[PDB]
Structures are given as C-alpha cells and as structure tokens.
C-alpha cells in the first residue's frame, strides 16, 4: 500500500560566507535522510544507523571519491552558468534526482536542475529529452541531447539502478521505513476547537471537522516532531448559536472524536 522513494539533493553556492559549505549532497529514503557529504567534511557519511550497519567502510570510501568528483563538476558548471548570465557574487545551483517504487511494482524517476532556486533543466527519460527554461539552458540541453550514450545511461540509472538501490535500502531500514505509528488525537478549546494529532508516521494524514463538512477550517501543517514522528491540527470557530466532531484518517484507519 506504501509508495517508497529514493532522492538525492545537490546544492552548490559560489562565494559562500566563511564556514558555510560551497557544496552539500544529501540522500533520503522517503522522509528519512540516509547519506550526507559536504565540501567542509569531504566525507560521505551515513545519516541512519541501519545505513552504517549494512554498508562497509569500502562503500563510504568509494562514495567519498565519487562525491569529490561531483563537488568539482558542480563548481565548474555553476561558474560557467554565471559567465553565460554575466552574473557575479553568490549564486545557487541545485540538482534533484530520484525514483518511486509503488505497491503494484510500477516505478517513476525524475532528474532536474535549478539556478537561483528557479527551474533550469528538466529531464524526460521517456522521450530522452530536456525541457529548458531559457536560451542558456537550451544551449546546454542541445549538447546533452547530442550525446545519446549519456541520455541512455541516465534513463537506465533512473529505471534500474535507483530502484535497485531503493530496494536494497528498504530491506536495510525495513523496521523504520515500513512501520506505521498511528496518531494520538485530542480536542482542546476565543471559543475555538483544536483537533491536535501527534506521534504519527508516515507523515500523510487527513484531518477535518463535521456537524455535513465545515467549510471555514484552519489547518496546521504536518511538522516533524524530531523523534521520527509528525504532528498537525485542524481548528474551527464556534457560532455562539450544533454538534461538532473531529475526523482523522491515517494509513487506512478512520478516527472520530465527538465533542459534547
């Protein structure tokens, strides 16, 4: 029933203020971070106990060397982009790559870049093409599309390797990644009722009020509690002149709290 995902994020900053990394890379399975690297440590490090226990030192030593390479490539690509835009000072380059494994077996994959936090280049692995936001991106896309070997490499990586990595990491983090922690839900009282849920995992939760759904409802965001679980809320105001109830849905289970 659960869709799982593996995602890598890459951040490059030119002229970073003293101490701040020029380059950072973090991987995630779902919301759980699994790996980190930056230009300050210059070391690939696990970010889950189940990654440290199942991947030997030689894995981290190899991945360190790969990330030293990706850090240099980022610096060079960002410096070229700044030239193409006659930009100086600090500018941002971002890369995001990932796949999803669905319950049924179907997969998705994605790869995109941003310059200064705006879409730059988006890969379509089905048409083996790149969408480019502007002439500078278009010029780069056209060189990438002239290299059929690299496109086919990326499609195979997204569809086969990323998914094999995800399946390997799901097995390693089985007990953490596949668990359900059902929410604790309470109601508290300006004469408003707050429906408050916490201790839940995974983060996906639906919360509402009824009496007939209430239309004018404030929603708290799903926020991380820090201990691997999440919290959220839905509030309503009471017309002083009517029997109200909180409805929560989580991982296939429905909960109702009737308020007297």
């Amino acid at each position: 029933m659960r869709t799982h995902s593996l995602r890598y994020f890459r951040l490059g900053v030119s002229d970073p203020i003293h101490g701040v990394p020029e380059f950072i890379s973090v991987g995630y399975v779902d919301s759980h971070p699994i790996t980190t690297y930056d230009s300050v440590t210059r070391q690939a490090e696990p970010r889950a106990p189940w990654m440290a226990e199942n991947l030997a030192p030689d894995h981290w030593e190899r991945y360190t060397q790969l990330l030293r390479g990706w850090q240099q490539m980022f610096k060079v690509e960002l410096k070229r982009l700044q030239r193409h835009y006659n930009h100086s000072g600090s500018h941002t380059y971002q890369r995001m790559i990932g796949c999803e494994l669905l319950e049924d077996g179907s997969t998705t994959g994605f790869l995109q870049y941003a310059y200064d936090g705006q879409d730059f280049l988006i890969f379509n692995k089905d048409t083996l093409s790149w969408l480019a936001v502007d002439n500078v991106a278009h010029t780069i896309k056209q060189a990438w599309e002239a290299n059929q070997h690299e496109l086919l490499y990326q499609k195979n990586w997204l569809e086969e390797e990323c998914i094999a990595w995800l399946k390997r990491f799901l097995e390693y983090g089985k007990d953490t990644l596949q668990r359900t922690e059902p929410p604790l839900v309470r109601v508290n009282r300006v004469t408003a009722l707050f429906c408050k849920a916490h201790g839940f995992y995974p983060p996906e939760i639906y919360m509402t009020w009824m009496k007939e759904i209430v239309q004018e409802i404030d929603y708290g965001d799903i926020l991380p509690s820090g201990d691997g679980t999440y919290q959220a809320w839905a509030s309503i105001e009471l017309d002083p002149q009517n029997l109200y109830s909180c409805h929560v849905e989580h991982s296939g289970v429905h909960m109702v709290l009737q308020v007297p």
Partner: antibody
Framework: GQNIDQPTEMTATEGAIVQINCTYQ??????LFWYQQHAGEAPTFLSY??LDGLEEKGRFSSFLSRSKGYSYLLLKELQMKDSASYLC??????????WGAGTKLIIKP | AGVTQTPKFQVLKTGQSMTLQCAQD?????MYWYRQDPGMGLRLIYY???????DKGEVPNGYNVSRSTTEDFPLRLLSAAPSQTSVYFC???????????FGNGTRLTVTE
C-alpha cells in the same frame, strides 16, 4: 561486479565479417564498453551499450542482452588494419570499470 | 590534442625512483593509471575523481600519485622493483561513467 569472459583469439578472412562475444555477471550495471587496441598502441573507445539492442557506426556494430548478460562487437567488410585486440569492460553499480582479458583478432588475407 | 604521457620507454635499476607524467587539456575530472601484463588484463594502480583527491586501484603497492591540477596525474615508482616491469597507460574520462581516453603508454623495464 563479479566476472567477464571473451575468447583469447579469433581468426577471420579479409572482406568477411567477425563477431567478438563478451559474457558478464554482475549485480549492478551502468553500461558495457568495447575498446580497440592495436599492437604497441593505447586502447581506443569503439562503443557503449546500456539498454538492450544494436548500435551501428560505419563497419562496426555493438549488441547488448541484459537478460543473458551478453554483448557482441560485429566487424563487417574486414580489412587487414582491423587486426588488433578488442577489450570489453562494464561499469558495476559503484562505477568500477571491470576489464575482460581481451580478444586478439587476426585477419587472414 | 588528447592525453600526453611521457616517457614512452624507460629502463631503471632496482631501487631507483621514477615519475611518469600524464597531462590532458580536455578538462576531464577522472584520471587513471593502469598497468597491462600478458594474460593479466588491465589493472588499475590509482585513480583521481578530481583535482584535490586520489584513491588506490586493485594494485597500489610500490606506486604513488598526486592530483594538484585537473590537467596532470603523475605516477611515481618510489623504489623500482623487477615486478614493475610493465606497460603503463594513463587515461582520462569526463565522468565516472564516460569513455576513457588513453595516453600512448610507457614501456618500463627494471633490471638489477
């Protein structure tokens, strides 16, 4: 990244065709390469396959079967200058380049 | 103009030190040293994923390298031994998955 095999030596007639086979075994794959090495010279890149199918370029073709773990290099209208070693190699999941022992192609006039 | 590797031939006495030079002006991030021995296939001695870093291959013992620049990846035999009699190939690649460009090789003999 476990194993790779290709014949030691092959012999074909000038003007004909030859197919050099390469088998590989690996849990993890990022593409298979063919390189040509003339005696007393450096290896030179010929081809890259990562999906199933057949790539063609002049007299040369490269085929890959992911399920069988199997590539071939096909050389058509063989010339004396095609006498060389042909090296297959494949990238594993960590980008280890694994080299076959090479196949020497002798072209008989 | 590709990968430049010098020298093309070298005789050394057991115990001598030697530096093989390798340069590429293609801005490739990856540089490699391999030795080639009859039957043995291509064995990786050392590689560099970028300037500022290096790492061992299959057979690093008796050898050293440095990567001060994108362009250059020197290979050092600190104490020439007869077992290092071989053909050495420097190579570069744009990325970890892209094709290798090879230098024209160093044929090295170590005699007593």
């Amino acid at each position: 990244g476990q194993n790779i095999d290709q014949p030691t030596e092959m012999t074909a007639t000038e003007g004909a065709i030859v197919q050099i086979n390469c088998t590989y075994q690996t849990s993890g794959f990022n593409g298979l390469f063919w390189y040509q090495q003339h005696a007393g010279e450096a290896p030179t890149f010929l081809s890259y396959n990562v999906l199933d199918g057949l790539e063609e370029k002049g007299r040369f073709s490269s085929f890959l079967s992911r399920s069988k773990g199997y590539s071939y290099l096909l050389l058509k209208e063989l010339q004396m200058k095609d006498s060389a070693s042909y090296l297959c190699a494949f990238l594993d999941s960590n980008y280890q380049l694994i080299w076959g022992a090479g196949t020497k192609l002798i072209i008989k006039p | 103009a590709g990968v430049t590797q010098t020298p093309k031939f070298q005789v050394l006495k057991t115990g001598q030190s030697m530096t093989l030079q390798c340069a590429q002006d293609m801005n490739h991030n990856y540089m490699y040293w391999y030795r080639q021995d009859p039957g043995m296939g291509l064995r990786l001695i050392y590689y560099s994923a970028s300037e500022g870093t290096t790492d061992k291959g299959e057979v690093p013992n008796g050898y050293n390298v440095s990567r001060s620049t994108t362009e250059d990846f020197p290979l050092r035999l600190l104490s020439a031994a007869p077992s290092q009699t071989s053909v050495y190939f420097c190579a570069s690649s744009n990325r970890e998955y892209s094709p290798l460009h090879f230098g024209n090789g160093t044929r090295l003999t170590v005699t007593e």
